[PDB]
Design a protein around this ligand. Sequence first.
Ligand code: E0X
Ligand code: CL
Ligand code: CL
Ligand code: CL
Ligand code: CL
Length: 270
Amino acid sequence: SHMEELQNKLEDVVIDRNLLILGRILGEFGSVMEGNLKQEDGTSLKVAVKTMKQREIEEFLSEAACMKDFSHPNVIRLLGVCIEMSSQGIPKPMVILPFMKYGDLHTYLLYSRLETGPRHIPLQTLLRFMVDIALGMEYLSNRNFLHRDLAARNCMLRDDMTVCVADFGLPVKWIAIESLADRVYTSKSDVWAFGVTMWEIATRGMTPYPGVQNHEMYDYLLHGHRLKQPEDCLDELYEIMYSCWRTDPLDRPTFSVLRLQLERLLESLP
Ligand SMILES: Nc1nccc(Oc2ccc(NC(=O)c3c[nH]cc(-c4ccc(F)cc4)c3=O)cc2F)c1Cl
Ligand SMILES: [Cl-]
Ligand SMILES: [Cl-]
Ligand SMILES: [Cl-]
Ligand SMILES: [Cl-]
């Protein structure tokens, strides 16, 4: 039953604080730390730990339990959560994820445009990044999960270069036209944000809409303007991402449709 499934998820989301040791800051709303997690088989695992600052706390726990129960290779796996208490009596919620040494997709795309950073990223890999993200989002949306902050900064690179969808939980230019006004939000709003994320990846990390300030943003879209085609972006890839920003959400493709369009384009590549 609905209460049964929720209580089951709740049961195995919590990690004993003594199985975890925190390490150095990776980033600093909250902070992200490197850490170690003792697994049940006796060995420890490198993890990332995210820390923040009672009705909100059950909300954090139940939403963490829901994400951990999700399982798909292009959705970040949430290993568990841990609730500390601060001296001043403020709870300190912590989220445990696998440590991914390649970091987030956005910083990686930027790094790749520096000699010392990752090598230049071929088109084939850039489109394989989009396929991966579309796969995680297909799985999520088939569950009526709404992401609401999709962007390359929130996609993570795994050791085998698989991309998985995440949310640091810590952006006008990613928000669908209808959500800018009515604040209505559907998976078709997520589809809009995916289109922009595809554009981030194709530009190797440009901020969307150069020359357009955030306050000008809804007016800019109101008159039918969209993100421009990056150079050396295939026209077929640009039409796919343009389809994500159709004015009428109902006309935008689903993630399942997008994913197959993108897998089709990828195999056509010599
Ligand atoms: N190097 C390195 N390696 C690993 C992680 C890392 O940082 C982090 C990267 C991601 C996260 N995510 C979360 O806390 C999180 C919490 N609730 C829900 C989601 C979620 C939301 C939507 C969705 F579709 C999928 C998941 C989360 O993602 C935390 C980090 F600390 C770093 Cl920096
Ligand atoms: Cl060990
Ligand atoms: Cl990994
Ligand atoms: Cl643009
Ligand atoms: Cl345009």
